[PDB]
Design a binder for this molecule. Structure first.
Ligand SMILES: *O=P([O])([O])[C][P@@]([O])(OP([O])(=O)O[C][C]1O[C](N2[C]=NC3=C2N=C([N])[N]C3=O)[C]([O])[C]1[O])=O*
Ligand SMILES: [Mg+2]
Ligand SMILES: [Mg+2]
Ligand SMILES: [Mg+2]
Ligand SMILES: [Mg+2]
Ligand SMILES: [Mg+2]
Ligand SMILES: [Mg+2]
Ligand SMILES: [Mg+2]
Ligand SMILES: [Mg+2]
Ligand SMILES: [Mg+2]
Ligand SMILES: [Mg+2]
Ligand SMILES: [Mg+2]
Ligand SMILES: [Mg+2]
Ligand SMILES: [Mg+2]
Ligand SMILES: [Mg+2]
Ligand SMILES: [Mg+2]
Ligand SMILES: [Mg+2]
Ligand SMILES: [Mg+2]
Ligand SMILES: [Mg+2]
Ligand SMILES: [Mg+2]
Ligand SMILES: [Mg+2]
Ligand SMILES: [Mg+2]
Ligand SMILES: [Mg+2]
Ligand SMILES: [Mg+2]
Ligand SMILES: [Mg+2]
Ligand SMILES: [Mg+2]
Ligand SMILES: [Mg+2]
Ligand SMILES: [Mg+2]
Ligand SMILES: [Mg+2]
Ligand SMILES: [Mg+2]
Ligand SMILES: [Mg+2]
Ligand SMILES: [Mg+2]
Ligand SMILES: [Mg+2]
Ligand SMILES: [Mg+2]
Ligand SMILES: [Mg+2]
Ligand SMILES: [Mg+2]
Ligand SMILES: [Mg+2]
Ligand SMILES: [Mg+2]
Ligand SMILES: [Mg+2]
Ligand SMILES: [Mg+2]
Ligand SMILES: [Mg+2]
Ligand SMILES: [Mg+2]
Ligand SMILES: [Mg+2]
Ligand SMILES: [Mg+2]
Ligand SMILES: [Mg+2]
Ligand SMILES: [Mg+2]
Ligand SMILES: [Mg+2]
Ligand SMILES: [Mg+2]
Ligand SMILES: [Mg+2]
Ligand SMILES: [Mg+2]
Ligand SMILES: [Mg+2]
Ligand SMILES: [Mg+2]
Ligand SMILES: [Mg+2]
Ligand SMILES: [Mg+2]
Ligand SMILES: [Mg+2]
Ligand SMILES: [Mg+2]
Ligand SMILES: [Mg+2]
Ligand SMILES: [Mg+2]
Ligand SMILES: [Mg+2]
Ligand SMILES: [Mg+2]
Ligand SMILES: [Mg+2]
Ligand SMILES: [Mg+2]
Ligand SMILES: [Mg+2]
Ligand SMILES: [Mg+2]
Ligand SMILES: [Mg+2]
Ligand SMILES: [Mg+2]
Ligand SMILES: [Mg+2]
Length: 197
RNA sequence: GCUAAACCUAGCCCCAAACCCACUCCACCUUACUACCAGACAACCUUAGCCAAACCAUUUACCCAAAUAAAGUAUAGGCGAUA
RNA sequence: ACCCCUAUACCUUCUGCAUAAUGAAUUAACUAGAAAUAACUUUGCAAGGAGAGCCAAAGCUAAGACCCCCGAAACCAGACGAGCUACCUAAGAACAGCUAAAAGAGCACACCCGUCUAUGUAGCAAAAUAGUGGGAAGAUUUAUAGGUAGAGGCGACAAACCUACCGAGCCUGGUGAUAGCUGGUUGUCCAAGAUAGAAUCUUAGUUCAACUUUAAAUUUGCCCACAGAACCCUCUAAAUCCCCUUGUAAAUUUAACUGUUAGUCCAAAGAGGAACAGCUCUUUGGACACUAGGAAAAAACCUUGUAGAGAGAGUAAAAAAUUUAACACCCAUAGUAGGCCUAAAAGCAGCCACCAAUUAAGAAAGCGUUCAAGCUCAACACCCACUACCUAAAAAAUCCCAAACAUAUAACUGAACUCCUCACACCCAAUUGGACCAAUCUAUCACCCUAUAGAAGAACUAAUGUUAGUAUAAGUAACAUGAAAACAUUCU
RNA sequence: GCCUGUUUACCAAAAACAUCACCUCUAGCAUCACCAGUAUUAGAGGCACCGCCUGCCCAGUGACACAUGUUUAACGGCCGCGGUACCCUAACCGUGCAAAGGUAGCAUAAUCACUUGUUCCUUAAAUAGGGACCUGUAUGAAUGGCUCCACGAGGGUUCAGCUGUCUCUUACUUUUAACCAGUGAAAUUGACCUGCCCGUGAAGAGGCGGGCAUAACACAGCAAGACGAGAAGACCCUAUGGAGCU
RNA sequence: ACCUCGGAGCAGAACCCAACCUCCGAGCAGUACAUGCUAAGACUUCACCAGUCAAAGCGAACCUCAAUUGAUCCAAUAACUUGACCAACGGAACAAGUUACCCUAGGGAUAACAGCGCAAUCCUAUUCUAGAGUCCAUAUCAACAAUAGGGUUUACGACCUCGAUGUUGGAUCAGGACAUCCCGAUGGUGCAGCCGCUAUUAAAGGUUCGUUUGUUCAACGAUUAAAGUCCUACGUGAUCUGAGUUCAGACCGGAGUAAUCCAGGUCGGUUUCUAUCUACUUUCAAAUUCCUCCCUGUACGAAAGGACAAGAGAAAUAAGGCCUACUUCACAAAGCGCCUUCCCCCGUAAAUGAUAUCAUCUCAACUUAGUAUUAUACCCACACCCACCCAAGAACAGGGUU
């Protein structure tokens, strides 16, 4: 039982058209985005700051949840969503809040929408683990999109150069993507262990 | 000592000289070796290519009037291999 | 006879083969250097030679001597093929039984095909057998005859079939096609004999250079001493060129040719790489592809070269030495719980200061304390071994690897090197030069097998070479005949 | 893949080829084919019954018209950047290019890779299988797109049934096999009087170096080695060597 | 990527010298028109072709630069002269792509698998004490560095092999190394006990069954004392499989006008050998491991929790045998059935005592744990042999025939 690695390339002939630092910076940006989604949304407490998700289609186009109205703080077991007496907006927010990933249990009675959430020591933790897994899958999808963009750029820049250099660059991009996948899996496992601990 | 080994002579080759052959009886172009019946149609045509030019694309002696010489000369030829 | 000491079969391709790189079971027979211009030698004649033609400022004529074999996929021309198979034409034949819904329907025989498995693989068979399968009244199968043929035929397109091997059939002919590629290239002995590169549809080849070989003319050839061979920045080496003597004996030029020109290791100066490789590329030198001795067997490391017999001798190179860590005994009272800073920080959290009491102890060098307290060390008192040659070792896979020996005087052993008696041409790849030579025929001799000359189908340990004989595998794989009997018959 | 059927005789029977259905193009015609036929016909083709459909383009090529044209069920093609409100998307706007900018449908597929895409069912365990989502940045409509009746020696998954496939093999018969009697091959063979360990060597030794072992000889098995035998590697490279095809 | 020419370094002081070695440049330009004609002697890019300098002489006034370039034939012209990025630049007058339908002659001169050389990469062991570990370098880890060892992996070289070294996994059989996963025995601990961490010694024995992917790798389920690493031509295909991976058919996406192709996916796709030589074909035997009860609910703690040691009993695997029960079966052979199975192993822990009058376990002389063995069980009768039988057996051999 013994693992194995590879090597790494760094020269100017590659930088003459494709910079290997831009893909690393984009991967680090995706890492930071996932870390922000983990440490900003739902951790242990609901928090009024976790309502920054995505809304449904309103007048052809999806918007946010906090930029439309405002979220105030009153009691630790109630989240009042005061708005501006708009008809379709309340129903849109109720529909966009209901199948999120965390069980909000909303009670709408006209304008004031309260979100009371107690504390569950098992089901809520499992729902949070599932939401973190969905966020990790979204980060993986974004990483795959970045990988496809980089591969399209490398395919656009390969006709006037040898095939060995293109193969080495493809192998290095695959190694970077594998390292990013390993880091995403490590973060997901740490978050799951913290939630189920 | 067994298997074995050995033989000369049938014939053949290259020339000279000289021009050379073919129904005993019957059968033999239809399914040849078939004795015996009505659409008769009928042949005349530049060789090519391998190969050499170190590839290959024009090109490359072979052609049927005795010898020797002129002479491998005049000539021809991606004026080149070569003729 | 064996036992004892020595010894890594041959050819070919290679830098290098015992290589586990190729070829070969053996025997007999057969099977591979054909020729010109120009040069050399020997005659003849001679400013002329020649038996017309042609050459000629010593030439002309004659003779001798000299340039291999087998092997492709391919191309073209003309014949021969549809008795197998692809399709078509003519006139035929076959399809039990059941359910039949009516049917390019269902189960299922005969028949056609061949999904899967197993046996077989020089087998029964150059495509089978046994089981299991699809179709089986149709776009079915099949008996006979005919037709479409290769720059093509045919094709429900598999680039499928066209007489067992069709990306283009087979036979004959051009054809002894060609091949820079592989393999082979047959008597004895002797001598000389290792190459800077350039060009190239060219790096698997060739030409010219370089080396080598033969035959000639001529005189200088090599080693070398004073002198000498710009510079500039920082250094600037081992060295190199020219070169009188001197030891030497070779060098230059002319004529005619082949062959080498796909190389390795070591020492040194370098470049690339990893200041890696039995790694790649230059330069200087050496060795090998040539004998022998040594380092275990070993190409390139050391000694050594010119050839034989000897049951003589002196020698060259030639045997690896190291074994390692001890350490001190004793005594610690005090201004003072030095000041600052710190809740506290007392010799030892952080700084400034580091004075000073007793014959001796630093305003504290290591710990230790939350702060203190306790442990030492630096200092007397006390005797005083040395109080230190610094450090500098490790494990892989079948089984360690000659046996051993610390103590009778430095010498001995050890080659194809050298000497000794004798005779001496008698140990390199490709290539070149030379002296001989068996069989055969012819001219003349010879007459129990030879001689002088001319000639050539003129020599086989080797080409998965051809034919024939016999071995090894091997007396091996494999192959047979149902039983009794009166040999009338009977039984399974 | 609609079905029956057809094919690589001798390693591939299939999802491949054909097939009824649909569509495009060509042709106004007499004696040897097509045809002793005449535009509801004949030939050259694509696709593949049926059911719903088959979106846009003649810029280029080709074809037809020679009136700059007509033709895509002809060859073929169906966009790019930025501003876009707390999140992936965005209705929207600005802008360039074009012939048009992928329409309906379906969808991680037999569909480059990322890919074990995400999720539910199935198993104790599911990179296997089935149902849902679409960044399919290389899906998509006679290069036909999508459902469906029947069928398939086509390719995958699976409930129940019990079968030596297995846990774990055992017994019996025949063939085979060993001996006896008869006949009697083939590949292979440099010569061999043909051992083991370590090391060396053209780098993997029965033949070399150092040790060990060692009377001769039949017969039956096994396959670790002889870099084992058949086929001058079929993979890689060279040849101013061939051939097929476009 | 490059193909021709020039300058510098490698190449330091006559000449020369390569590299897919390191840097610059060139395919021109500018001024006179004697940039006229002839002619000794020389240099020469290692050949040749080309290229370079030039005394004197006839005439006439009183050349810069470094490369700056192109042979023959042929064509234009009355002539003198002229004509190519013939740049593949010593230059064919004019010719591309694909072949997995492929063929031939060769090459280990040259690749893919193996072996071999190296160790860039990888792994491991020691040295210094930064820094973690509350203080505390060394219970444990280890930053920058240093010294060595190994040849699992990825690469490098092309040294044997292309007149063929069969290639990945899996099955059977395993041999070996220890750098030890478990069973044995010790030192230390940030060791109160159970679990643990680290180090030394120890290779006699063992190291599971299943789902998915063809997998070796990898994820998961249930276990176990453990489900160890590595080598053996990434062990073993003349013992077996071909699941993928190395053809000919075909489909999808893409590239290409097309043939055709993809280190893209998928369905299908012939595994031939009668053993000549070496080696071998019962070594006759001295097995391991888990679990249950007692101790004990004790030692230990504050409680939870919780041991060693001694003893007893049951098992599992492995080896060697057997047919009385059961079972396949039946005057036999077998397991699913039954019986038996016995010695250690050395790293340290301690007395006396010098070198060094203390002390000190001793590569000081010496004394203990400390050596199981100089182990015992099998088997060991030289010839009656036609023939018959046999629990003996291929033939042979062996036993009985009273
Ligand atoms: O409240 P509690 O949680 O139950 C503590 P408790 O019950 O302790 P107790 O009395 O149950 O004791 C526990 C064990 O102690 C044993 N014991 C008591 N007396 C004696 C023993 N054991 C002896 N060996 N010897 C005695 O004399 C009991 O057996 C029990 O098991 O108070
Ligand atoms: Mg030719
Ligand atoms: Mg030639
Ligand atoms: Mg040798
Ligand atoms: Mg050869
Ligand atoms: Mg060689
Ligand atoms: Mg040999
Ligand atoms: Mg060879
Ligand atoms: Mg042979
Ligand atoms: Mg016929
Ligand atoms: Mg029918
Ligand atoms: Mg039927
Ligand atoms: Mg047909
Ligand atoms: Mg086809
Ligand atoms: Mg020839
Ligand atoms: Mg000589
Ligand atoms: Mg060549
Ligand atoms: Mg070398
Ligand atoms: Mg104190
Ligand atoms: Mg001597
Ligand atoms: Mg001598
Ligand atoms: Mg002859
Ligand atoms: Mg002869
Ligand atoms: Mg002979
Ligand atoms: Mg042979
Ligand atoms: Mg022969
Ligand atoms: Mg017999
Ligand atoms: Mg035999
Ligand atoms: Mg037999
Ligand atoms: Mg019979
Ligand atoms: Mg079908
Ligand atoms: Mg077939
Ligand atoms: Mg057929
Ligand atoms: Mg078949
Ligand atoms: Mg079809
Ligand atoms: Mg359309
Ligand atoms: Mg895909
Ligand atoms: Mg399965
Ligand atoms: Mg069918
Ligand atoms: Mg060896
Ligand atoms: Mg041998
Ligand atoms: Mg072989
Ligand atoms: Mg060959
Ligand atoms: Mg060439
Ligand atoms: Mg050619
Ligand atoms: Mg040709
Ligand atoms: Mg042809
Ligand atoms: Mg010269
Ligand atoms: Mg002058
Ligand atoms: Mg050229
Ligand atoms: Mg050139
Ligand atoms: Mg194909
Ligand atoms: Mg094909
Ligand atoms: Mg070949
Ligand atoms: Mg080689
Ligand atoms: Mg290798
Ligand atoms: Mg610290
Ligand atoms: Mg080399
Ligand atoms: Mg080979
Ligand atoms: Mg061989
Ligand atoms: Mg150990
Ligand atoms: Mg293997
Ligand atoms: Mg084998
Ligand atoms: Mg099949
Ligand atoms: Mg086999
Ligand atoms: Mg042998
Ligand atoms: Mg208790």
């Amino acid at each position: 039982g013994q693992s194995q690695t590879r090597v790494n390339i760094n020269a100017a002939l590659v930088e003459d058209i494709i910079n290997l630092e831009e893909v690393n910076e984009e991967m680090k940006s995706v890492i930071e985005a996932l870390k922000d989604n983990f440490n900003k949304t739902l951790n242990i407490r609901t928090s009024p700051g976790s309502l920054d998700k995505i809304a449904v289609v309103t007048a052809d186009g999806k918007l946010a949840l906090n930029q439309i109205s405002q979220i105030s703080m009153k009691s630790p077991q109630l989240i009042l969503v005061n708005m501006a007496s708009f008809p379709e907006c309340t129903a849109a927010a109720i529909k966009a809040i209901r199948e999120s990933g965390m069980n909000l249990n909303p009670e709408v009675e006209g304008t004031l929408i309260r979100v009371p959430i107690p504390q569950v020591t098992r089901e809520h933790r499992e729902m949070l683990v599932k939401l973190a897994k969905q966020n990790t899958n979204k980060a993986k999808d974004s990483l795959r999109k970045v990988r496809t963009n980089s591969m399209n750029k490398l395919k656009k820049s390969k006709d006037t150069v040898s095939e060995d250099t293109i193969r080495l660059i493809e192998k290095q991009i695959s190694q970077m993507a594998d390292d990013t996948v390993a880091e995403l899996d490590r973060h997901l496992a740490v978050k799951t262990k913290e939630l189920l601990g």
